[PDB]
């Protein structure tokens, strides 16, 4: 939560990882990772 | 959630609102609101019934009034303790809000000639002797917020005004997550509409109902029950033993 | 009697009102009103208020469209220069804008069945009933109003310079100062009273639904905690009647809070 | 009337408000309110007043009349700017609604001789300038601009300008619900006319009363005071006025002389 | 909701009434009325958050007054000396009493001071220097204030008490236009309706974010995704292809 959203989105714009990976690596709740994935146009 | 975290932080560094406040205002989950609150080092009856009291803080006397029904708060620091400024504050709060009854103690300032003259001129009923738990809880909550915002307080008056502003607007309350202003607006609006509709009836609907006695007037018929009023007394009877004419 | 004779004779040479109107309005004995009426050389059904009757007549070579209220006898007449369905639709939309009419009685004339009339009645939601009316009383009222309007127009044509002005003066004197044969009241007063007393059920039902939509928080005499969202029935000065799970309770105003939970 | 006269006197001494306000607030006849107002040393009919306005749309002139107490609207487009058509509309609205005073603004066509003759025939006092009511000035223009907004919206679904304007004013009068109360303008205007009829019935009931000199006694004092002007008799009591003081006395402590 | 949606659609294509009227006259939820209004090509307010500030001189002393753009509500006070501190105090008090988002005022010296700028920046208040027709309303209110303070000065000992009494009588016991009510009822009704509309729109925003798929009587295959409008009584009201339909909950799924 401590600036994890910015790093999560900046790494998702390059690798497009699964929401579980973002939740585990950056310590974010699953809902944040799911909505970050949804915000990606390439991913669904 | 659309860039709402940044504005939530920028408003928490501004007013330091409760978690539910920014949770409901900016549409964020309660978990992130609680995390934002924790991350801050400084954080961890009737519409006419109003209660006025006096408090002491660092050699300053403050007259504080509170709406009992909605929890709305007002305060003003009086420089020299005299009844004339108490009367001034009373007439100002009357001019800003309709008050029909004030609950105070037998203090000299509350019973002063100017205060009595103003309240009799405004037609406000007086009641001496006092409910108090809610007033004390609001007082300590406002003391807490005053301590919270004292770091940026250039003067006492501005600090008190900002504390009142953040209490009445920048914090959600209890039932329904509504602030004091929202609650008082809701209760005033409901009272106005109910009295308007009550004045609408008894101009069109006028029926006489006999039960068991006298020519009582119909008040509400339905759901197998007749509620009527007679001789300034309200009686509820079953649908039987009641004739509506 | 306090100079009322002069003002009465002035308003009678200008209006030719009924003697009951002179007696009631100017506070004069009936003998004075009767002699004022005599001095003038030109003088000698409870139902739904949604029913109106429209008719056309040929007077002085001009076409006059008259709409009459069944329940009160109120009249509205206009002079139509060229007989066309467009002007009939104009009159219909005028009377719809000025009155909440819901049913119109007309004959089988060419302009009555015009496409504009059908469009107007469909848009305004006004029931249409062609053919002979089923109530002879309405026809009798139509005939009486027709003869009275012919008489008053003949009386007042000298004052006006145009037929429309004479018709408007006639409708003005008939509606406001003229007193009918039942009750002795003006047609405008009768129709406005009927309209005022007619809109009661809709407002009653909407107020009942609104008052049932309210929420009430109440406490018992010995219970310091507040109860749930009890439905509201009736509000009083010091007592409130509410429903709480099919139970009727009367609560003092002191221990009752009334709220509309928007959320 | 349950000790409301004293409350009205106190309210007029502390505020000096309009007589109708005291009459409505305390459920009193207008006569006692008028006499209380006249009792004030520093102090001395809303229905039946209409306001007329002119506007330009599609290169044509449209005249709209609006009530003040209820806001009922009437509107019509005039082929050419002449005083005869305005006089015709004024006499038509006189023959359709009870009009007592026609208020307007400055205008060349409003000062014509034809409209003056038309209003003199009807006995309606006409004037122009500042609105009679110190408030609700903006109501007329807000209603006019609402009508202007809706006529453009409903124009596309109509074939003629006059029909569209009349349909728009019909929607505004009937099919447009307001705020407080939430009902049609026709309903509020008919309620106002009904209350006017009831107040006129009260006025004729007061007219039934006349001089009827009445003597009064207070607190069972051996002396009889008077004469006092009779105001009203009912509910076993009589309310009268004398020396700018209005009081209610039980019938057992008063006598009436023809 | 008992086939009243089609009737509301027809009467909205006919009359084009407000969404509140459509909801009230047919017991429809606000979502249905809002989507019906939106679907209409003919159809397309932050009023309480707009205030006007004005200063005047009386008896050699300065008097400030803030007036709501609508309903003619006013609030006035006297000031000893015209500097930024008193103006900031008054602005903070009015912010603490009422929710304000923007303010219109003239180009006075006290309005251009840094103190008021900081005070309004603290509360996020838009300060505009410079109003279609509110000038007449505000000037008429000011003239009424002048006449009432002139009339009430006879029994007053200080100007502040007279001003307070005048604003009290004006805002409480001076019935105005339609309805014969005072400014307090108008302001409370306006703010209550604004709160109701904002909470309804927030509820719609938090509800509509879910998609639906329904089974009908002639096709076992789920169809959609329709837009979520309302749920309740064991059923869901949705809209597909700009047509509003109702489907039992047992024959529907929400994602």
């Amino acid at each position: 939560f401590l600036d994890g959203i910015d790093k999560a989105q900046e790494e998702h714009e390059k690798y497009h990882s699964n929401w579980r990976a973002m939740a585990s690596d950056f310590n974010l709740p699953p809902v944040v990772a799911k909505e970050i994935v949804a915000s990606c146009d390439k991913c669904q | 959630f659309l860039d709402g975290i940044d504005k939530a932080q920028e408003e928490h560094e501004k007013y330091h609102s409760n978690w539910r406040a920014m949770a409901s205002d900016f549409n964020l989950p309660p978990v992130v609101a609680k995390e934002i609150v924790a991350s801050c080092d400084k954080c961890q009856c009737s519409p006419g019934i109003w209660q006025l009291n006096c408090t002491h803080l660092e050699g300053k006397v403050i007259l504080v009034a509170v709406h009992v029904a909605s929890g709305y708060i007002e305060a003003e620091v009086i420089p020299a303790e005299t009844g004339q400024e108490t009367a001034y504050f009373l007439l100002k709060l009357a001019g800003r809000w309709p008050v029909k009854t004030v609950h105070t103690n037998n203090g000299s300032n509350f019973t002063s000639t100017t205060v009595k003259a103003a309240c009799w001129w405004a037609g406000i009923k007086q009641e001496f002797g006092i409910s108090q738990g809610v007033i004390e809880s609001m007082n300590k909550e406002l003391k807490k917020i005053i301590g919270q915002v004292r770091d940026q307080a250039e003067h006492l008056k501005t600090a008190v005004q900002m504390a009142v502003f953040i209490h009445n607007f920048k914090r959600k309350g209890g039932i329904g997550g509504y602030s004091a202003g929202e609650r008082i607006v809701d209760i005033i609006a409901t009272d106005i509409q109910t009295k308007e509709l009550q004045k609408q009836i008894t101009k069109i609907q006028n029926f006489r109902v006999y039960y068991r006695k006298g020519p009582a007037k119909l008040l509400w018929k339905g759901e197998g029950a007749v509620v009527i009023q007679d001789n300034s007394d309200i009686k509820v009877v079953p649908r039987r033993k009641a004739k509506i004419i | 009697f306090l100079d009322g004779i002069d003002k009465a004779q002035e308003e009678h040479e200008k209006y030719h009102s009924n003697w009951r109107a002179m007696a009631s309005d100017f506070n004069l004995p009936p003998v004075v009103a009767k002699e004022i009426v005599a001095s003038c050389d030109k003088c000698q059904v409870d139902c739904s208020p949604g029913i109106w009757q429209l008719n056309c007549t040929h007077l002085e070579g001009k076409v006059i469209l008259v709409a009459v209220h069944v329940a009160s006898g109120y009249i509205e007449a206009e002079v139509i220069p060229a007989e066309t369905g467009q002007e009939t639709a104009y009159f219909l939309l005028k009377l719809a804008g000025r009155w909440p009419v819901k049913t119109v009685h007309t004959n089988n004339g060419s302009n009555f069945t015009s496409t504009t009339v059908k469009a107007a009645c469909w848009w305004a939601g006004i029931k249409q009933e062609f053919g002979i009316p089923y109530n002879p009383q309405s026809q009798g009222v139509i005939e009486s109003m027709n003869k009275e309007l012919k008489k008053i127009i003949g009386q007042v044509r000298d004052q006006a310079e145009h037929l429309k002005t004479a018709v408007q003066m006639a409708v003005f004197i008939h509606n406001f100062k003229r007193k009918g044969g039942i009750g002795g009241y003006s047609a405008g007063e009768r129709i406005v009273d009927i309209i005022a007393t007619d809109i009661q059920t809709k407002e009653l039902q909407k107020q009942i639904t609104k008052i049932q939509n309210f929420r009430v928080y109440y406490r018992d005499s010995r219970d310091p905690v507040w109860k749930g969202p009890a439905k509201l029935l009736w509000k009083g000065e010091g007592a409130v009647v509410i429903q709480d799970n099919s139970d009727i309770k009367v609560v003092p105003r002191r221990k009752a809070k009334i709220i509309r939970d928007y959320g | 009337f349950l000790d409301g006269i004293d409350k009205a006197q106190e309210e007029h001494e502390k505020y000096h408000s309009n007589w109708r306000a005291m009459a409505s607030d305390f459920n009193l006849p207008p006569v006692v309110a008028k006499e209380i107002v006249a009792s004030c040393d520093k102090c001395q009919c809303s229905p039946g007043i209409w306001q007329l306005n002119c506007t330009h749309l599609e290169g044509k002139v449209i005249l709209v009349a609006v009530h003040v107490a209820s806001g009922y609207i009437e509107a019509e487009v005039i082929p050419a700017e002449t005083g005869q058509e305005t006089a015709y509309f004024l006499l038509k609205l006189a023959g359709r609604w009870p009009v007592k005073t026609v208020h307007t603004n400055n205008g060349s066509n409003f000062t014509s001789t034809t409209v003056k003759a038309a209003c003199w025939w009807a006995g309606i006092k006409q004037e122009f300038g500042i609105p009679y009511n110190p408030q609700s000035q903006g109501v007329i223009e807000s209603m006019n601009k609402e009508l202007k907004k809706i006529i453009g919206q409903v124009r596309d679904q109509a074939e003629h300008l006059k029909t569209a304007v009349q349909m728009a004013v019909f929607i505004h009068n009937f099919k447009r619900k307001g705020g407080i109360g939430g009902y049609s303008a026709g309903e509020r205007i008919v309620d106002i006319i009904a209350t006017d009829i009831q107040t006129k019935e009260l006025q004729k009931q007061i007219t039934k009363i006349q001089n009827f000199r009445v003597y009064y006694r207070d607190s069972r004092d051996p002396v009889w005071k008077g004469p006092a002007k009779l105001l009203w008799k009912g509910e076993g009591a009589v309310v009268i006025q004398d020396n700018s003081d209005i009081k209610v006395v039980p019938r057992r402590k008063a006598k009436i002389i023809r | 909701f008992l086939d009243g949606i089609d009737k509301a659609q027809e009467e909205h294509e006919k009359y084009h009434s407000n969404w509140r009227a459509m909801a009230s006259d047919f017991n429809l939820p606000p979502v249905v009325a809002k989507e019906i209004v939106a679907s209409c090509d003919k159809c397309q307010d932050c009023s309480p958050g707009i205030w006007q500030l004005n200063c005047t001189h009386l008896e050699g002393k300065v008097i400030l007054v803030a007036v709501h753009v609508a309903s003619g509500y006013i609030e006035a006070e006297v000031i000893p000396a015209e500097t930024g501190q008193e103006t900031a105090y008054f602005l903070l008090k009015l912010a603490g009493r009422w929710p304000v988002k923007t303010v219109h005022t003239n180009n006075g010296s006290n309005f251009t001071s840094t103190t008021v700028k900081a005070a309004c920046w603290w509360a996020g208040i838009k300060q505009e220097f410079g109003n279609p027709q509110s000038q007449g309303v505000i000037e008429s209110m000011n003239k009424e204030l002048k006449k009432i303070i002139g009339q009430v000065r006879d029994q007053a000992e200080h100007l502040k008490t007279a001003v307070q009494m005048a604003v009290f009588i004006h805002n409480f016991k001076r019935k105005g236009g339609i309805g014969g009510y005072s400014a307090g009822e108008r302001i409370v009704d306006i703010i209550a309706t604004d709160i109701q509309t904002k909470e309804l729109q927030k509820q719609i925003t938090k509800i509509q974010n879910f998609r639906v798929y329904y089974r009908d009587s002639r096709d076992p295959v789920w169809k959609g995704p329709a837009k979520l409008l309302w749920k309740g009584e064991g059923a869901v009201v949705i809209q597909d292809n700009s047509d509003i339909k109702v489907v039992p909950r047992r024959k529907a799924k929400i994602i």
Binding site: - | - | - | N106, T111, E127, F128 | -
Partner: protein, 220 residues
Amino acid sequence: PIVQNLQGQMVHQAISPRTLNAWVKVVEEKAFSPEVIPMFSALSEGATPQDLNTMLNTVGGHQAAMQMLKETINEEAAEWDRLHPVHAGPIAPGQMREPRGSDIAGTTSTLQEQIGWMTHNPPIPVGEIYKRWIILGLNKIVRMYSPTSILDIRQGPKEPFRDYVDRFYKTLRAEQASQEVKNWMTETLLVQNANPDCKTILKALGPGATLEEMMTACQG
């Protein structure tokens, strides 16, 4: 400004701040109304062109009128230069040549030149000419700033004659023309543009009646 000395030689006097403050406040307060024409002439009695320019530049806003008066000053300075013959011959000590079009405006001439011209015998009325030029400029500015004509004033049927005559004379003074035309219009339009009752009253009173007689007769 140029102040006469008690049985001595006149010397330059500093401009009091009161005059500048009063001038700027009265200019900013009400309008570019005709009443500023005398007021200005009361605040610039015997002032040098430099003082006049300093007073002119003190105003704030309404720079369009400043451009108008500057253009008129330029054109009338050119006219003065073209009409007044150019001085020729040597200039003796203690004397100066005729001020140029720029010198009368004070844009380039210094205070010493103005003092020398004032002390020259006979004195040159450069200051008076510049003051009357400014007067003409202000007159045309007021002409532009009048949003009404003289022939469009109408009296309401119930409007009192008091404010009607007041506005009539306000527009008469706002309008600049020959005196004979002003007399003709104030004698004709007054009766010709009144309510019918007072119009017939004035016709009964006859022509040439003093305005006091008509204002006393029209009462009621």
